[PDB]
């Protein structure tokens, strides 16, 4: 999925956040890795 860079920290397990609050939340004891990168070039259209 694609999210604003600011809410990247929201996805952290056990951490709240608008996305965490009601969009999608990891379990507090999630095991694995969080991989993300800037997609500004690929996913930022001049028209929005």
């Amino acid at each position: 999925f694609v999210i604003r860079g600011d809410e990247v920290r929201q996805i952290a397990p056990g951490q709240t956040g608008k996305i965490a609050d009601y969009n999608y939340k990891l379990p507090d004891d999630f095991t694995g890795c969080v991989i993300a990168w800037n997609s500004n070039n690929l996913d930022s259209k001049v028209g929005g």
Partner: protein, 49 residues
């Protein structure tokens, strides 16, 4: 007063305290039980003799 992911930590600390107290109480208890039981055997022998 606290959201889940940090509330268990406070809960966890309380568990240690209360559990430790039970061990102290229980551990203290049976020691007296041995003493009184030892005293009881003395009393029983005195009754018999």
């Amino acid at each position: 007063r606290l959201d889940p992911p940090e509330a268990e930590v406070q809960i966890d600390r309380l568990i240690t305290g209360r559990l430790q107290s039970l061990q102290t109480y229980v551990t203290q208890q049976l020691i007296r039980a041995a003493e009184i039981r030892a005293s009881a055997n003395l009393a029983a022998t005195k009754m018999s003799e």
